[PDB]
C-alpha cells in the first residue's frame, strides 16, 4: 500500500510500488499470465537475502531501542515481509516448472505486495519512533521555558541562556530535517512557520529577562510590565512549541499503542 507517510520512505518504495501496480493491472487483463518468463531463481534468491538483512537489522533495532512501542510494533513487520517473501519464492518455483502458471502469478503478486507492505510498516514504525524523539526534545524545551520565570539575577540569566541555547538548537535542527520529510504542505508550513516564531522570540525572551532581572535590580522602577512581557513571550513560545508537538503528533501516532 501507499504507506509512504514520509518523503524518503516514498522515494524508496515508490519505484517498486509502481511495478507492482502493473503486475496487478496486467494480471487483471489477462496479459500477465501471457509471456513465458525466464528463471527467477537468481533474482528471487537476492530479495530473499535482502529481506534477511532487513529483518536482521530490524531485530537489532529492537534490541537496542528504548522505545517500547517500536519494540512491540517492529517484530510483526518482520513476520510480514518474511512470509510474504516465501510466497515470492514459491511463485518462482511454480514458474520454474511452468512459465505460464496463473496461480504462480497470483503468488508472485501477493508476495511482492507483502514485501513492499512489510518494508513500509518496518520503516514507518521505525520513523514514528524517531518522531517521538523530537516530541520528547520539544517537551523538554517546554519544561525549561517555565524555568525562565525563576531567573532573578544576571548570573541566572547567563546559566539559563547557556542551557536553553543548546536544546533550542537541537529541536531547531530536528524540526529542519523533519519538515523536509513531510508529505503534506499544510503540515510542513505549520511545522516551519511555528518553529520560526520560536526562533524569532528566543532573543525577545532573553531581552524580557534581562530587562526584568535589571529593572528589578534597578530597584524602584516599573516591574509589573517587565514581568508581564516576560511571561507573555514564555507563553507565546510555549504555545508555538505545542503546535509543533501537536503537528508532529498528528503526522505520527499509529494507534496500536493504546
Amino acid at each position: 500500500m501507499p504507506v509512504f507517510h514520509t518523503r524518503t520512505i516514498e522515494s524508496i518504495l515508490e519505484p517498486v510500488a509502481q511495478q507492482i501496480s502493473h503486475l496487478v493491472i496486467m494480471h487483471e487483463e489477462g496479459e500477465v499470465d501471457g509471456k513465458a518468463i525466464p528463471d527467477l531463481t537468481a533474482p528471487v534468491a537476492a530479495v530473499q537475502a535482502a529481506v534477511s538483512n532487513l529483518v536482521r537489522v530490524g531485530k537489532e533495532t529492537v534490541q537496542t531501542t528504548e522505545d517500547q512501542i517500536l519494540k512491540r510494533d517492529m517484530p510483526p513487520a518482520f513476520i510480514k515481509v518474511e512470509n510474504a517473501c516465501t510466497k515470492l519464492v514459491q511463485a518462482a518455483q511454480m514458474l520454474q516448472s511452468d512459465p505460464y502458471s496463473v496461480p504462480a502469478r497470483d503468488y508472485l503478486i501477493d508476495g511482492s505486495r507483502g514485501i513492499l507492505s512489510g518494508t513500509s510498516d518496518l520503516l514507518l514504525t521505525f520513523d514514528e519512533a524517531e518522531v517521538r524523539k523530537i516530541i520528547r526534545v520539544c517537551k523538554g524545551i517546554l519544561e525549561y521555558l517555565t524555568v525562565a520565570e525563576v531567573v532573578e539575577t544576571m548570573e541566572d540569566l547567563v546559566t539559563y541562556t547557556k542551557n536553553l541555547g543548546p536544546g533550542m538548537t537541537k529541536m531547531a535542527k530536528m524540526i529542519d530535517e523533519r519538515q523536509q520529510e513531510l508529505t503534506h504542505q499544510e503540515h510542513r508550513v505549520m511545522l516551519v512557520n511555528s518553529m520560526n516564531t520560536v526562533k524569532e522570540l528566543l532573543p525577545v525572551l532573553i531581552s524580557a529577562m534581562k530587562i526584568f532581572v535589571t529593572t528589578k535590580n534597578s530597584k524602584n522602577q516599573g516591574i509589573e510590565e517587565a514581568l508581564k512581557n516576560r511571561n507573555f513571550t514564555v507563553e507565546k513560545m510555549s504555545a508555538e512549541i505545542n503546535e509543533i508537538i501537536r503537528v508532529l503528533q498528528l503526522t505520527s501516532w499509529d494507534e496500536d499503542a493504546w
Binding site: 547567563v158 541562556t161 536553553l164 541555547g165 538548537t169 528566543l202
Partner: peptide
C-alpha cells in the same frame, strides 16, 4: 559585571547555531 556581557555573548553563539 561581565554578566550582562556574557548573557549576550552566550545568546549570540546560540542564535548563530540556531542559524
Amino acid at each position: 559585571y561581565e554578566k550582562a556581557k556574557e548573557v549576550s555573548s552566550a545568546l549570540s553563539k546560540v542564535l548563530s547555531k540556531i542559524d
